[PDB]
Amino acid sequence: HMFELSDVIEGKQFDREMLSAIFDVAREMEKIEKSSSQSEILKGYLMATLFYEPSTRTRLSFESAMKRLGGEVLTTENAREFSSAAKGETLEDTIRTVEGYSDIIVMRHFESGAARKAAATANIPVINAGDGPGEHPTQALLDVYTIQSEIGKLDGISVALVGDLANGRTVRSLAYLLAKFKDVKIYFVSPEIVKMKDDIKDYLTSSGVEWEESSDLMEVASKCDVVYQTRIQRERFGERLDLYEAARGKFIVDKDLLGVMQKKAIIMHPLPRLDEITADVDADPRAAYFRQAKNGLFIRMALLKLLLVGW
Amino acid sequence: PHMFELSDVIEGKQFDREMLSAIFDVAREMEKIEKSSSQSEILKGYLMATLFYEPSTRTRLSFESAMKRLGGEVLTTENAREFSSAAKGETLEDTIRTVEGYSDIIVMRHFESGAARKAAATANIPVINAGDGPGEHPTQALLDVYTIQSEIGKLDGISVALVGDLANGRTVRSLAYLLAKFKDVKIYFVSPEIVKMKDDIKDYLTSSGVEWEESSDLMEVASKCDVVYQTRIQRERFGERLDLYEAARGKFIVDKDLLGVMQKKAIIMHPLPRLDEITADVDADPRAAYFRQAKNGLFIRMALLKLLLVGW
Amino acid sequence: HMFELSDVIEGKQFDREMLSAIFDVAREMEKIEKSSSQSEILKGYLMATLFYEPSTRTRLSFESAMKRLGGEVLTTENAREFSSAAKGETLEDTIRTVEGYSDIIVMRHFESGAARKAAATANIPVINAGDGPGEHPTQALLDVYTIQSEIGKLDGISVALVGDLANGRTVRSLAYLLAKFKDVKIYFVSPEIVKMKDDIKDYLTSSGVEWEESSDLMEVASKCDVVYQTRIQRERFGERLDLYEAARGKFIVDKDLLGVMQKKAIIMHPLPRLDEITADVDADPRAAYFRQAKNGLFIRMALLKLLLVGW
Ligand SMILES: O=C(O)C[C@H](NC(=O)CP(=O)(O)O)C(=O)O
């Protein structure tokens, strides 16, 4: 039976029941990945990757997912220089060409809106691996799955979203999906200059999600099941050096922060990180960001299976 | 069963009519394999090494897909100038001798004409020329002729328009060369005056029994042809005269008005990539064949890999 | 039983008995590679490559080795620009990410010491494919295998190491392995600016290996079993292109040099070469550098097999 989605492009394609069913499949994929026996679920299928921006986690997890299921991969790892995009070929022409060689396309473009255009052009499934600074739906899926896996529930949780909330596609998209669950509380922890935009705030309010803004990470972290960290780039302060200095050292996950957190809470980060999570934190079992990346393998295995062979 | 008569695929002149027709029959067999649900194991155990010194979408990915659709594997070198030890200064001959130690067939797109021939002479395994700088692109010519046969139903007795920079055009020259292997073919040359087809092709066509005609009226030509083969006007060929490039670029466009004069079962081809020389409108017409053409490259390259590695 | 090494990082990890046993495995891998049947020894296993500097032989021989054994490969063939290392990600974060997708990591880095750091971080085997101008243990293994194959002995051999010794991660690791044999003599022949570094000299002296510096390549070549030529390592000279050009052209293997060498002696070179072996040498049966590179396939097959499935 076919998967109801023809492409995986944006968070709004998913409802709670679909998320639960996908997560069920991802748990089965964990069993497959831990086995000694090579799976042949996707034997005979080919994935074409089209990476127009750099990637470590999303590119390698999709390729590993395909090969762990017995499929194969045709990679284009830097499309703007190594493909005929370098000769001016449009996205739509690239898609209509590559679909002749493959059964599914995984694309990370440089412009928001590209993934939807690719899906509309292609007659094979497309997965958005990051749409420039826009949607990154499989990151949001693996983030929610990781919370469920680590905490054991999604209803009734408290999540701190930390860092560049105004511009951060990962925190915005995670908030969007968490709103499909019940009794969720979200804390928006950031300097005022990069606070969460009103579109997400209004959506959470309409969805019955309680939310609170704070600039006090130490206070918030003691009350949360999940601290989900992102960086605030220096450039986001613009010429306001005063605000950069006022925020300095206040939005970092360090050993002192772990000291106020609950024993069963976790630290998440979509990666890559820089110094906004210190290396000491890594030694704590609650540091979940590498387990989170591994969960992307299982989620992407699930999606490849569903899009290519269905339920 | 017998050995393929070619040890390498380097240039159009290696092919005669009989060989072309036989390869096209193998390509039709490969289309049946590619459509099947069962994974082929014809090339299980064989390894292809790619060596791409210039960018590619169609040629690189179709060869890799062809190999994997037949059950073989691929070792890719996707930007050889930068990430291979050619970046350290290595000669082509040393690269080829090295890579043959790891692989069973080499597919190479170089930037210098004559590289493919030098690679075949060095290697003791088959080499396929995936484009040779200003030189030949033989598998493109094979897939072009195959596409005409598949779309029109015949090669003898067809009319083909070749459009663009004909003076420097690699694909139009090689297509003309192979079409001359068939009978009662007529070719129309449509180009800006500055980049007309060179005399070497004109004389070969007349010598080979192909009628040809130059025209500056694409609307008149297109109404009389089974195939309109469009190409991209490229800046590099105009040297330090950007003004001449811009003048040439606008002249011969395949647009809705041109499709409106074409025959009901004619086709538009283009080796790709295109810029604006085929408008987006044309894509909506069933006669726009350039994406089917690219797909046919998969079947042709499957056929060549099979023939070169395991024979007829 | 399990292989006694958990990673292949440094020449000093190998003792004489281990080298002889690895060479026996490599001979079995040669039989596999020459056979018409596809091996499935490593079916189900995935190798991740991480190449932060260019490579032809090391990269392709490892990938070919893995596929010839029936495994699969996830490539990052330009990690500095095409992975998230371009965004500042530390090596330790890259390793902990990639290990979630793979069973073994093969890494070439531009910084000496990187492979040992990776091994200390990863809970899967790591193979050093070259760590800056530091070491290159698998080149050293294939080099010693080649000497044994071509000369028929390692004890009592005389080896000339020629060219850029200072920066030559090849000759550094090779020196470490040659010291495991008896009655060896090594000649160092180089421009003064790139003479062998003191760490290697001190190690050979402490191991009882005779060594001698000389600037007379014709004299040295006439009395050696092996003349091991190298490329002047331009990428290690930084901005000192004056010193780079001064170091070239001083020591050339040409027909005149072969004319003074013994009939049983060989020329080796890890490759690529530029001008330092003339093309007319290639026709001489003693020119062993292409056989050497082929032997790398068998040695790397052996290491992948041993690290993943044991003896
Ligand atoms: O590059 C050299 O000159 C020697 C040595 N060469 C190799 O390992 C072969 P490659 O660089 O093609 O992998 C190296 O240290 O990288």
PDB file of N, CA and C in Angstrom, chain C residues 160-230:
ATOM      1  N   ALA C 160      67.767   2.783  -0.087  1.00  0.00           N
ATOM      2  CA  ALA C 160      67.993   4.216  -0.206  1.00  0.00           C
ATOM      3  C   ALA C 160      66.643   4.921  -0.197  1.00  0.00           C
ATOM      4  N   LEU C 161      66.470   5.862   0.730  1.00  0.00           N
ATOM      5  CA  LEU C 161      65.300   6.732   0.790  1.00  0.00           C
ATOM      6  C   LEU C 161      65.734   8.072   0.218  1.00  0.00           C
ATOM      7  N   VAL C 162      65.118   8.471  -0.887  1.00  0.00           N
ATOM      8  CA  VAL C 162      65.587   9.591  -1.691  1.00  0.00           C
ATOM      9  C   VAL C 162      64.491  10.634  -1.806  1.00  0.00           C
ATOM     10  N   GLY C 163      64.882  11.900  -1.714  1.00  0.00           N
ATOM     11  CA  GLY C 163      63.984  12.983  -2.057  1.00  0.00           C
ATOM     12  C   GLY C 163      63.582  13.834  -0.884  1.00  0.00           C
ATOM     13  N   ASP C 164      62.276  14.030  -0.700  1.00  0.00           N
ATOM     14  CA  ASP C 164      61.787  14.874   0.388  1.00  0.00           C
ATOM     15  C   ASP C 164      61.558  13.959   1.580  1.00  0.00           C
ATOM     16  N   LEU C 165      62.589  13.825   2.409  1.00  0.00           N
ATOM     17  CA  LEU C 165      62.495  12.955   3.575  1.00  0.00           C
ATOM     18  C   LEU C 165      61.852  13.685   4.749  1.00  0.00           C
ATOM     19  N   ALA C 166      62.140  14.980   4.893  1.00  0.00           N
ATOM     20  CA  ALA C 166      61.593  15.750   6.004  1.00  0.00           C
ATOM     21  C   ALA C 166      60.077  15.642   6.076  1.00  0.00           C
ATOM     22  N   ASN C 167      59.406  15.835   4.940  1.00  0.00           N
ATOM     23  CA  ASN C 167      57.952  15.903   4.863  1.00  0.00           C
ATOM     24  C   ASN C 167      57.326  14.602   4.398  1.00  0.00           C
ATOM     25  N   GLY C 168      58.128  13.577   4.187  1.00  0.00           N
ATOM     26  CA  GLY C 168      57.627  12.371   3.572  1.00  0.00           C
ATOM     27  C   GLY C 168      57.014  11.420   4.563  1.00  0.00           C
ATOM     28  N   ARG C 169      55.696  11.492   4.706  1.00  0.00           N
ATOM     29  CA  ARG C 169      55.041  10.578   5.629  1.00  0.00           C
ATOM     30  C   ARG C 169      55.244   9.123   5.222  1.00  0.00           C
ATOM     31  N   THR C 170      55.475   8.871   3.932  1.00  0.00           N
ATOM     32  CA  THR C 170      55.799   7.531   3.440  1.00  0.00           C
ATOM     33  C   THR C 170      57.112   7.014   4.022  1.00  0.00           C
ATOM     34  N   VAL C 171      58.201   7.752   3.805  1.00  0.00           N
ATOM     35  CA  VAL C 171      59.505   7.274   4.247  1.00  0.00           C
ATOM     36  C   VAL C 171      59.601   7.238   5.765  1.00  0.00           C
ATOM     37  N   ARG C 172      58.849   8.106   6.456  1.00  0.00           N
ATOM     38  CA  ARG C 172      58.834   8.063   7.912  1.00  0.00           C
ATOM     39  C   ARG C 172      58.233   6.754   8.415  1.00  0.00           C
ATOM     40  N   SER C 173      57.049   6.392   7.930  1.00  0.00           N
ATOM     41  CA  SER C 173      56.468   5.132   8.367  1.00  0.00           C
ATOM     42  C   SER C 173      57.276   3.939   7.878  1.00  0.00           C
ATOM     43  N   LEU C 174      57.850   4.026   6.676  1.00  0.00           N
ATOM     44  CA  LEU C 174      58.641   2.914   6.156  1.00  0.00           C
ATOM     45  C   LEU C 174      59.859   2.660   7.034  1.00  0.00           C
ATOM     46  N   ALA C 175      60.516   3.727   7.482  1.00  0.00           N
ATOM     47  CA  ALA C 175      61.636   3.578   8.396  1.00  0.00           C
ATOM     48  C   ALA C 175      61.220   2.847   9.666  1.00  0.00           C
ATOM     49  N   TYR C 176      60.032   3.160  10.199  1.00  0.00           N
ATOM     50  CA  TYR C 176      59.597   2.486  11.417  1.00  0.00           C
ATOM     51  C   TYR C 176      59.481   0.988  11.187  1.00  0.00           C
ATOM     52  N   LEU C 177      58.941   0.580  10.036  1.00  0.00           N
ATOM     53  CA  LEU C 177      58.753  -0.849   9.786  1.00  0.00           C
ATOM     54  C   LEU C 177      60.057  -1.562   9.447  1.00  0.00           C
ATOM     55  N   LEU C 178      60.936  -0.918   8.686  1.00  0.00           N
ATOM     56  CA  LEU C 178      62.198  -1.565   8.359  1.00  0.00           C
ATOM     57  C   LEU C 178      63.003  -1.859   9.614  1.00  0.00           C
ATOM     58  N   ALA C 179      62.826  -1.051  10.663  1.00  0.00           N
ATOM     59  CA  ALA C 179      63.546  -1.288  11.910  1.00  0.00           C
ATOM     60  C   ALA C 179      63.138  -2.574  12.608  1.00  0.00           C
ATOM     61  N   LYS C 180      62.057  -3.223  12.191  1.00  0.00           N
ATOM     62  CA  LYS C 180      61.668  -4.492  12.801  1.00  0.00           C
ATOM     63  C   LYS C 180      62.458  -5.672  12.265  1.00  0.00           C
ATOM     64  N   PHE C 181      63.309  -5.457  11.276  1.00  0.00           N
ATOM     65  CA  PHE C 181      64.106  -6.521  10.684  1.00  0.00           C
ATOM     66  C   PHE C 181      65.572  -6.367  11.051  1.00  0.00           C
ATOM     67  N   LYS C 182      66.342  -7.415  10.769  1.00  0.00           N
ATOM     68  CA  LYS C 182      67.728  -7.509  11.210  1.00  0.00           C
ATOM     69  C   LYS C 182      68.677  -7.085  10.090  1.00  0.00           C
ATOM     70  N   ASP C 183      69.789  -6.460  10.479  1.00  0.00           N
ATOM     71  CA  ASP C 183      70.920  -6.234   9.584  1.00  0.00           C
ATOM     72  C   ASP C 183      70.556  -5.293   8.437  1.00  0.00           C
ATOM     73  N   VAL C 184      69.602  -4.396   8.665  1.00  0.00           N
ATOM     74  CA  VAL C 184      69.173  -3.456   7.636  1.00  0.00           C
ATOM     75  C   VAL C 184      70.118  -2.264   7.621  1.00  0.00           C
ATOM     76  N   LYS C 185      70.340  -1.709   6.432  1.00  0.00           N
ATOM     77  CA  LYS C 185      71.026  -0.436   6.291  1.00  0.00           C
ATOM     78  C   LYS C 185      70.174   0.495   5.449  1.00  0.00           C
ATOM     79  N   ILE C 186      70.011   1.727   5.915  1.00  0.00           N
ATOM     80  CA  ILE C 186      69.245   2.743   5.204  1.00  0.00           C
ATOM     81  C   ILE C 186      70.163   3.906   4.843  1.00  0.00           C
ATOM     82  N   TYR C 187      70.100   4.330   3.594  1.00  0.00           N
ATOM     83  CA  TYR C 187      70.760   5.544   3.142  1.00  0.00           C
ATOM     84  C   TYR C 187      69.714   6.626   2.969  1.00  0.00           C
ATOM     85  N   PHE C 188      70.020   7.824   3.451  1.00  0.00           N
ATOM     86  CA  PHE C 188      69.180   8.995   3.235  1.00  0.00           C
ATOM     87  C   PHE C 188      69.868   9.872   2.192  1.00  0.00           C
ATOM     88  N   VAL C 189      69.164  10.180   1.105  1.00  0.00           N
ATOM     89  CA  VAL C 189      69.690  11.025   0.031  1.00  0.00           C
ATOM     90  C   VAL C 189      68.678  12.131  -0.228  1.00  0.00           C
ATOM     91  N   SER C 190      69.040  13.376   0.075  1.00  0.00           N
ATOM     92  CA  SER C 190      68.078  14.460  -0.045  1.00  0.00           C
ATOM     93  C   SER C 190      68.818  15.777  -0.167  1.00  0.00           C
ATOM     94  N   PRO C 191      68.174  16.794  -0.721  1.00  0.00           N
ATOM     95  CA  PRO C 191      68.622  18.162  -0.451  1.00  0.00           C
ATOM     96  C   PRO C 191      68.645  18.396   1.056  1.00  0.00           C
ATOM     97  N   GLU C 192      69.589  19.234   1.501  1.00  0.00           N
ATOM     98  CA  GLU C 192      69.724  19.501   2.931  1.00  0.00           C
ATOM     99  C   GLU C 192      68.420  20.020   3.520  1.00  0.00           C
ATOM    100  N   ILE C 193      67.713  20.878   2.778  1.00  0.00           N
ATOM    101  CA  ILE C 193      66.494  21.500   3.284  1.00  0.00           C
ATOM    102  C   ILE C 193      65.410  20.490   3.641  1.00  0.00           C
ATOM    103  N   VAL C 194      65.462  19.271   3.095  1.00  0.00           N
ATOM    104  CA  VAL C 194      64.428  18.279   3.395  1.00  0.00           C
ATOM    105  C   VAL C 194      65.043  16.964   3.876  1.00  0.00           C
ATOM    106  N   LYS C 195      66.098  17.048   4.684  1.00  0.00           N
ATOM    107  CA  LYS C 195      66.692  15.839   5.243  1.00  0.00           C
ATOM    108  C   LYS C 195      65.747  15.197   6.262  1.00  0.00           C
ATOM    109  N   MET C 196      65.995  13.916   6.536  1.00  0.00           N
ATOM    110  CA  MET C 196      65.139  13.168   7.450  1.00  0.00           C
ATOM    111  C   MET C 196      65.177  13.814   8.827  1.00  0.00           C
ATOM    112  N   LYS C 197      64.013  13.906   9.466  1.00  0.00           N
ATOM    113  CA  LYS C 197      63.906  14.592  10.741  1.00  0.00           C
ATOM    114  C   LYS C 197      64.520  13.756  11.860  1.00  0.00           C
ATOM    115  N   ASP C 198      64.845  14.442  12.958  1.00  0.00           N
ATOM    116  CA  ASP C 198      65.583  13.804  14.044  1.00  0.00           C
ATOM    117  C   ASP C 198      64.779  12.697  14.720  1.00  0.00           C
ATOM    118  N   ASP C 199      63.446  12.806  14.754  1.00  0.00           N
ATOM    119  CA  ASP C 199      62.671  11.767  15.429  1.00  0.00           C
ATOM    120  C   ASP C 199      62.894  10.402  14.785  1.00  0.00           C
ATOM    121  N   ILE C 200      62.978  10.360  13.455  1.00  0.00           N
ATOM    122  CA  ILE C 200      63.211   9.091  12.764  1.00  0.00           C
ATOM    123  C   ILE C 200      64.641   8.622  12.987  1.00  0.00           C
ATOM    124  N   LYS C 201      65.603   9.536  12.835  1.00  0.00           N
ATOM    125  CA  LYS C 201      67.003   9.177  13.034  1.00  0.00           C
ATOM    126  C   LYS C 201      67.211   8.597  14.422  1.00  0.00           C
ATOM    127  N   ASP C 202      66.644   9.250  15.437  1.00  0.00           N
ATOM    128  CA  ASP C 202      66.835   8.784  16.806  1.00  0.00           C
ATOM    129  C   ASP C 202      66.195   7.418  17.009  1.00  0.00           C
ATOM    130  N   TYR C 203      65.049   7.179  16.369  1.00  0.00           N
ATOM    131  CA  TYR C 203      64.395   5.886  16.510  1.00  0.00           C
ATOM    132  C   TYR C 203      65.214   4.774  15.867  1.00  0.00           C
ATOM    133  N   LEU C 204      65.767   5.027  14.677  1.00  0.00           N
ATOM    134  CA  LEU C 204      66.591   4.014  14.027  1.00  0.00           C
ATOM    135  C   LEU C 204      67.842   3.718  14.846  1.00  0.00           C
ATOM    136  N   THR C 205      68.498   4.760  15.357  1.00  0.00           N
ATOM    137  CA  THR C 205      69.691   4.565  16.175  1.00  0.00           C
ATOM    138  C   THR C 205      69.373   3.728  17.407  1.00  0.00           C
ATOM    139  N   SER C 206      68.248   4.015  18.061  1.00  0.00           N
ATOM    140  CA  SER C 206      67.859   3.253  19.241  1.00  0.00           C
ATOM    141  C   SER C 206      67.456   1.825  18.899  1.00  0.00           C
ATOM    142  N   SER C 207      67.036   1.575  17.664  1.00  0.00           N
ATOM    143  CA  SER C 207      66.662   0.241  17.220  1.00  0.00           C
ATOM    144  C   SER C 207      67.825  -0.535  16.622  1.00  0.00           C
ATOM    145  N   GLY C 208      69.012   0.060  16.553  1.00  0.00           N
ATOM    146  CA  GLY C 208      70.159  -0.627  16.000  1.00  0.00           C
ATOM    147  C   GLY C 208      70.171  -0.745  14.498  1.00  0.00           C
ATOM    148  N   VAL C 209      69.423   0.098  13.797  1.00  0.00           N
ATOM    149  CA  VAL C 209      69.445   0.131  12.340  1.00  0.00           C
ATOM    150  C   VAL C 209      70.553   1.075  11.908  1.00  0.00           C
ATOM    151  N   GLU C 210      71.448   0.576  11.062  1.00  0.00           N
ATOM    152  CA  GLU C 210      72.486   1.405  10.469  1.00  0.00           C
ATOM    153  C   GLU C 210      71.877   2.379   9.470  1.00  0.00           C
ATOM    154  N   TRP C 211      72.232   3.658   9.579  1.00  0.00           N
ATOM    155  CA  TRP C 211      71.827   4.640   8.579  1.00  0.00           C
ATOM    156  C   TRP C 211      72.982   5.590   8.283  1.00  0.00           C
ATOM    157  N   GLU C 212      72.915   6.194   7.094  1.00  0.00           N
ATOM    158  CA  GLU C 212      73.970   7.052   6.571  1.00  0.00           C
ATOM    159  C   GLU C 212      73.341   8.062   5.625  1.00  0.00           C
ATOM    160  N   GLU C 213      73.726   9.329   5.764  1.00  0.00           N
ATOM    161  CA  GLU C 213      73.352  10.370   4.819  1.00  0.00           C
ATOM    162  C   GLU C 213      74.415  10.492   3.735  1.00  0.00           C
ATOM    163  N   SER C 214      73.970  10.677   2.495  1.00  0.00           N
ATOM    164  CA  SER C 214      74.897  10.887   1.394  1.00  0.00           C
ATOM    165  C   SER C 214      74.235  11.761   0.343  1.00  0.00           C
ATOM    166  N   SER C 215      75.043  12.542  -0.371  1.00  0.00           N
ATOM    167  CA  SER C 215      74.565  13.355  -1.481  1.00  0.00           C
ATOM    168  C   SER C 215      74.966  12.783  -2.836  1.00  0.00           C
ATOM    169  N   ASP C 216      75.513  11.574  -2.869  1.00  0.00           N
ATOM    170  CA  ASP C 216      76.004  10.945  -4.093  1.00  0.00           C
ATOM    171  C   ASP C 216      75.038   9.815  -4.431  1.00  0.00           C
ATOM    172  N   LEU C 217      73.985  10.147  -5.186  1.00  0.00           N
ATOM    173  CA  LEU C 217      72.951   9.157  -5.484  1.00  0.00           C
ATOM    174  C   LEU C 217      73.489   8.040  -6.377  1.00  0.00           C
ATOM    175  N   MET C 218      74.390   8.355  -7.314  1.00  0.00           N
ATOM    176  CA  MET C 218      74.917   7.291  -8.171  1.00  0.00           C
ATOM    177  C   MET C 218      75.689   6.259  -7.351  1.00  0.00           C
ATOM    178  N   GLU C 219      76.520   6.716  -6.412  1.00  0.00           N
ATOM    179  CA  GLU C 219      77.229   5.785  -5.540  1.00  0.00           C
ATOM    180  C   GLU C 219      76.261   4.985  -4.674  1.00  0.00           C
ATOM    181  N   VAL C 220      75.306   5.660  -4.042  1.00  0.00           N
ATOM    182  CA  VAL C 220      74.355   4.960  -3.180  1.00  0.00           C
ATOM    183  C   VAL C 220      73.550   3.940  -3.981  1.00  0.00           C
ATOM    184  N   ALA C 221      73.035   4.348  -5.141  1.00  0.00           N
ATOM    185  CA  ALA C 221      72.184   3.458  -5.921  1.00  0.00           C
ATOM    186  C   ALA C 221      72.932   2.207  -6.354  1.00  0.00           C
ATOM    187  N   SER C 222      74.250   2.303  -6.548  1.00  0.00           N
ATOM    188  CA  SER C 222      74.989   1.148  -7.043  1.00  0.00           C
ATOM    189  C   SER C 222      75.086   0.032  -6.013  1.00  0.00           C
ATOM    190  N   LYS C 223      74.806   0.319  -4.741  1.00  0.00           N
ATOM    191  CA  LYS C 223      74.989  -0.671  -3.686  1.00  0.00           C
ATOM    192  C   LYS C 223      73.725  -0.919  -2.866  1.00  0.00           C
ATOM    193  N   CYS C 224      72.560  -0.554  -3.382  1.00  0.00           N
ATOM    194  CA  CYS C 224      71.313  -0.772  -2.669  1.00  0.00           C
ATOM    195  C   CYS C 224      70.447  -1.807  -3.377  1.00  0.00           C
ATOM    196  N   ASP C 225      69.666  -2.545  -2.585  1.00  0.00           N
ATOM    197  CA  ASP C 225      68.659  -3.417  -3.164  1.00  0.00           C
ATOM    198  C   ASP C 225      67.433  -2.639  -3.607  1.00  0.00           C
ATOM    199  N   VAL C 226      67.151  -1.531  -2.935  1.00  0.00           N
ATOM    200  CA  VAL C 226      65.953  -0.739  -3.185  1.00  0.00           C
ATOM    201  C   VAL C 226      66.356   0.722  -3.246  1.00  0.00           C
ATOM    202  N   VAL C 227      65.932   1.408  -4.300  1.00  0.00           N
ATOM    203  CA  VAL C 227      66.001   2.857  -4.376  1.00  0.00           C
ATOM    204  C   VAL C 227      64.569   3.357  -4.328  1.00  0.00           C
ATOM    205  N   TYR C 228      64.214   4.023  -3.226  1.00  0.00           N
ATOM    206  CA  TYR C 228      62.853   4.487  -2.946  1.00  0.00           C
ATOM    207  C   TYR C 228      62.844   5.998  -3.136  1.00  0.00           C
ATOM    208  N   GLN C 229      62.311   6.432  -4.272  1.00  0.00           N
ATOM    209  CA  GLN C 229      62.261   7.833  -4.662  1.00  0.00           C
ATOM    210  C   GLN C 229      60.941   8.423  -4.207  1.00  0.00           C
ATOM    211  N   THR C 230      60.952   9.731  -3.964  1.00  0.00           N
ATOM    212  CA  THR C 230      59.766  10.436  -3.521  1.00  0.00           C
ATOM    213  C   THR C 230      59.577  11.737  -4.294  1.00  0.00           C
TER     214      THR C 230
END
